[PDB]
């Protein structure tokens, strides 16, 4: 199971944000998938998902999807939205993953170079 945060393009009209609990690379089929939120499962009515689509490239394998329309602020405040997958090809048969704003944001850092500008402040 993977997970991609909503497209920044969506986060410019500031109504809704969509999240893609991509599921793939597995066999057999009949994967159920559910979305946790701090231990609280959402309703299946909150989100939508596919059926196991036969995978083109990986031959004897299936894949599916699911989405959920989190609104702008409703993603902008934390709320990691764990996505949990139920299948039979796992040791404990289950897995779950999650995301937030700050899944990336990797080390933004403003260097600064200064000369010839006496600011009247120590260093």
């Amino acid at each position: 199971v993977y997970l991609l945060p909503p497209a920044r393009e969506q986060l410019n009209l500031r109504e809704s944000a969509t999240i893609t609990c991509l599921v793939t690379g597995f066999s057999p089929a009949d994967v159920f998938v559910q979305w946790m939120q701090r231990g609280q499962p959402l309703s299946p009515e909150k989100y939508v998902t596919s059926a196991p689509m036969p995978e083109p490239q990986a031959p004897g394998r299936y894949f599916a999807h699911s989405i959920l329309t989190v609104s702008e602020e409703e993603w902008n405040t934390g709320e990691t939205y764990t996505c949990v997958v139920a299948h039979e090809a796992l040791p404990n048969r289950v897995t779950e993953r999650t995301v937030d704003k700050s899944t990336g944001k990797p080390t933004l850092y403003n260097v600064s170079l200064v000369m010839s500008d006496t600011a009247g402040t120590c260093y």
């Binding site: 006496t118 600011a119 009247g120 120590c122």
Partner: protein, 118 residues
């Protein structure tokens, strides 16, 4: 930070003034530069009097500076004040560029009066 002196000192023109600033009595502070500098909106102390002898050209005869290592002190005497002397100053030691120093404010005002009725 380890330098210590009076924050603001006021006097009026024509008078003398004497300022004392303190340093820990260690060996170097008993045997190294003391200075009185004046800053502004231009970025830098301009030195006005030094413990090494140099006196600013505008302060010749006006003022001098003496060090009493036994008191852990150095003293600055200014006489013949004017309203052109009011501004922000600093006592300090060592190289002016660092801050082993202490900031002083100075406000000079004219000698009022002229009113025999009060």
């Amino acid at each position: 930070s380890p330098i210590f002196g009076p924050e603001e000192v006021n006097s009026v023109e024509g008078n003398s003034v004497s300022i004392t600033c303190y340093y820990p009595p260690t060996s170097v502070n008993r045997h190294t530069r003391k200075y009185w500098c004046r800053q502004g909106a231009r970025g830098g102390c301009i030195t006005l009097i030094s413990s090494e002898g140099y006196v600013s050209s505008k302060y010749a005869g006006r003022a001098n500076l003496t060090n009493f290592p036994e008191n852990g002190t150095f003293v600055v005497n200014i006489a013949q004040l004017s309203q052109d002397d009011s501004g922000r100053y600093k006592c300090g030691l060592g190289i002016n560029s660092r801050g082993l120093s202490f900031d002083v404010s100075l406000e000079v005002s004219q000698g009022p009066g002229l009113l025999n009725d009060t």
